[PDB]
Symmetry: D2
């Protein structure tokens, strides 16, 4: 079935810029991973945001909700910052218009363009989850599936964990 991929930024997409002496949220890393994945099937990627998810407002979440509602596809991957991924996932879970869709949020604790990143693994795992899970809203990270209502991000731990 067709997968639609939305990019909302996050650590996954960070890249070095000379002018900043540091990382900015750059081009979506998911496009770089899928470029060498030798895909059989139909995938389309759409840019929504280049924020760190720590800076997301109620209206940023509502804009993400609108974009997912404009998609005819029922298999959705949203790449995103880990810091408010739970907030975005809870918000999407509450929109009846998305009830028929399998929506999976994912990202990376380390930028894809930095050595030793989880990003490529997480993208493969999340693409499969978006294809294979029943309708609902999920966080796919650490090689497992989280329910957003019963999940938090534990910064001290460096992992999502159940409440």
């Amino acid at each position: 079935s067709p997968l639609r991929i939305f990019t909302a930024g996050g650590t996954i997409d960070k890249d070095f810029r000379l002018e900043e002496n540091g990382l900015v949220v750059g081009d979506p890393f998911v496009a770089e991973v899928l470029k060498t994945a030798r895909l059989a099937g139909a995938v389309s990627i759409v840019a929504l945001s280049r924020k760190d998810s720590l800076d997301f407002t109620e209206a940023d979440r509502e804009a993400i909700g609108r974009a997912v509602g404009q998609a005819v596809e029922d298999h959705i991957l949203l790449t995103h910052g880990t810091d408010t991924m739970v907030e975005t996932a809870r918000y999407l879970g509450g929109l009846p218009e998305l009830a028929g869709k399998t929506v999976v949020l994912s990202g990376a604790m380390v930028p894809g363009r930095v050595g030793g990143s989880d990003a490529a693994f997480n993208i493969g795992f999340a693409c499969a989850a978006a294809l294979m899970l029943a309708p609902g809203v999920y966080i796919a990270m650490h090689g497992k599936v989280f329910d957003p209502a019963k999940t938090r991000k534990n910064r001290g731990l460096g992992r999502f964990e159940p409440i």
Copy 2:
């Protein structure tokens, strides 16, 4: 205090995925399993055992090479199994496993890479994430997870020229 299960076990049978350069051969050999390098940086909640069954290019695979694999998979208590393997006889190995009543309650997923993990622009890390998900989320049975999709072994072939699995 919740204890993370380890519901997935990985077996390695070699293939392009695991190829590495050696000075000795002046070429690629089947090296250490690349899946182990991907899981080291995957920040897994669980722990995943990685059992080495074989180290060949799948072209050189016999009925008893396939039968060794069958019994190792059979004796695993885990019901979620990923087997990394060469692409040239993956379909043959998958068909053989699909006939073992012993595996009837297991989700068994075969995967690899068309480009070695240790070579630039490889599909390996994506395919490992996809296939781990497949082994966890598909109903019991035997599957090939390649190219971002699930193949039925019985209704699949390998196109050697194009380096892709295709339906029949």
Copy 3:
């Protein structure tokens, strides 16, 4: 002839830390490049500093000067931040105690651990410059040797340039 490598930090050594949500100056990247360089010769690496060179003082340069004078080697590579590389190199150029040594400063505009880095090339180029140039102090960057007295860092181009 034996090469001594001092690491003072800089963009070349930056690495991602979950805790900081960004880059820190990490372990020296020159050690990672030389690990796979299959060297025939005698090389030793010594850690001096992990600063961004923007934060170096006259006192820090004086310390760097004395540390380079501790080496009995006559061929020296100092990996260093690019922002005050010229100030450090001009300072060392005026130290009579270093007049018999070939001292080469280098670094990278992009961290070694980020994709698309100049670091490995710069380290190879700078190792050769330290071994092959006549006694003096030099900056090796952009595939050329700069005279520190006649050089500046021009953020306009993102490069060092002659004055």
Copy 4:
């Protein structure tokens, strides 16, 4: 207004450095020149003209292969030249160039890699930086730059066993 000179020219004659994985052949072939990928991100002050002469493994090399290299190097305007090359016949190529009086004013350096640039853990990027510096800074003559040092081709051999150049 200041013009940056381009005093170094690079010629590529293939070798392990340039090997890349090809689905079709189920292995490594000599691919595009890896030196071009390193120089792309080196943020050079100048430009380096990179010219592909040959795509062999250095073993498939007859006097006529060497002779085309000798002419291309002889006709270059630049007096600083780097030739990337397989390590198995690097000494033979270097000794042949050392015999051409038209090269008398030129600093000519041969280099390559024991591991393909496109394989994990390669010496290539370091070897390219080191050899570029060597081509610019050594007096006229012909040299091999490998293992972070400079070799006299007359006094050097490739130890295929230990994967290194060494003195005789």
